[PDB]
Design a protein around this ligand. Sequence first.
Ligand SMILES: CN1c2ccc(C(F)(F)F)cc2C(=O)C12CCN(CC1CCOCC1)CC2
Ligand SMILES: CN1c2ccc(C(F)(F)F)cc2C(=O)C12CCN(CC1CCOCC1)CC2
Lengths: 213, 213
Amino acid sequence: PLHPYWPQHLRLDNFVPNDRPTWHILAGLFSVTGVLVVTTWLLSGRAAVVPLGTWRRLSLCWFAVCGFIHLVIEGWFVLYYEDLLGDQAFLSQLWKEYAKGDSRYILGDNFTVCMETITACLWGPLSLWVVIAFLRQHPLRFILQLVVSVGQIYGDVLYFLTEHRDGFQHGELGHPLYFWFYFVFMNALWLVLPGVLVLDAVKHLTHAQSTLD
Amino acid sequence: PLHPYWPQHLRLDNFVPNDRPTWHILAGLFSVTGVLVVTTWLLSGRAAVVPLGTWRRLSLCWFAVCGFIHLVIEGWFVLYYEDLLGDQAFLSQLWKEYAKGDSRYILGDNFTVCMETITACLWGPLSLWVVIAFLRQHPLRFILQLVVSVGQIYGDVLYFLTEHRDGFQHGELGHPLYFWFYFVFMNALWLVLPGVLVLDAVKHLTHAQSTLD
Ligand SMILES: CN1c2ccc(C(F)(F)F)cc2C(=O)C12CCN(CC1CCOCC1)CC2
Ligand SMILES: CN1c2ccc(C(F)(F)F)cc2C(=O)C12CCN(CC1CCOCC1)CC2
């Protein structure tokens, strides 16, 4: 058909197909984020006021990845959601590819735009501030971790609930790549990893409160 | 016209007007919540493991009010949003009156239903658990306060942002009772009082973290 997105009765003008093969885009994102992850591992190795341990370093790598994604990938959507169609910039093509599992990013839905606006403006800088805090053993580190994780979980839950109440019409149900991987799995992370970071922070802050009392 | 809600080109069947005068409904809600507030004041007076102080007692009264509202008033909407029109139950009439400043509660918007579902299921019981925690000086008290306040702020911000992006079409702009009071003021509380409770909790938890370190 003219366009690949769901529902198929959509009428999208100014749709022009992605020029690059999709694996260019996907592999570029994975390569750059892997470089970011290894660089953050090294940084936590050499730039910590006191040693951190393996799993906290991995948590900082996660927070750096979240900061990059929210500031750049989602920020590009928030800036240019009106012109994702008919554009051949790298991040625009990435969004066009991703939206085949969720067409709300092409339709400019109000809830989506608002949620990604909040995510790009608040949770990205706060995710990087978490890393800065943990490097210097500042206070607020577990507080910021808890706040960011709670916000991410709330946003993802609202996202899933709204798409469910719409009947899963913005994406083909049961398609391996577009439903299970793009829509479910890549979002289920922001339900699972933040959750572990909420149970963890609560364990430490509580131990602090019992120390005062 | 047939119905009072905005936009006026809406076509609502099964609309049947409120039977009671509106001040019955408003005064009943204010009277019962005032009884709740004074009862919570007394309870914090006589049922605290250690004395709490005036402003913390007021915070507990706020949390009890939030718990009642989220569990009952918003829970009624989540349960019966399909049949608010054409019903003459007390809370149904309350919702019909309130929606004259925001018609999304009559239209059953997906974002509204999902947000109030989360609010009724999570933040109400957690708001009451905050009170129970503060009464017994359990830990988690400031953690729960922070989490509930952050969730309330996030929900209210998304609410306002979505209605703004819609152009303020679900309510008459600049009407004293329906815009400033119902829509803005009654919601601005959940931006102002939670915020003060986020700056407060951060002050205490931080002092705990500095005690461990
Ligand atoms: C569009 N986008 C992607 C596009 C492609 C790829 C891939 F396939 F290349 F791996 C990954 C992602 C992402 O991580 C996302 C960006 C980050 N959000 C996280 C949510 C934002 C709202 O709040 C809850 C969390 C999921 C999808
Ligand atoms: C409908 N409803 C009312 C109806 C009437 C009256 C009045 F006029 F009688 F005072 C008060 C209220 C409320 O408090 C509310 C219930 C509570 N929400 C709080 C938000 C819920 C979503 O997340 C952010 C906070 C505002 C309006």
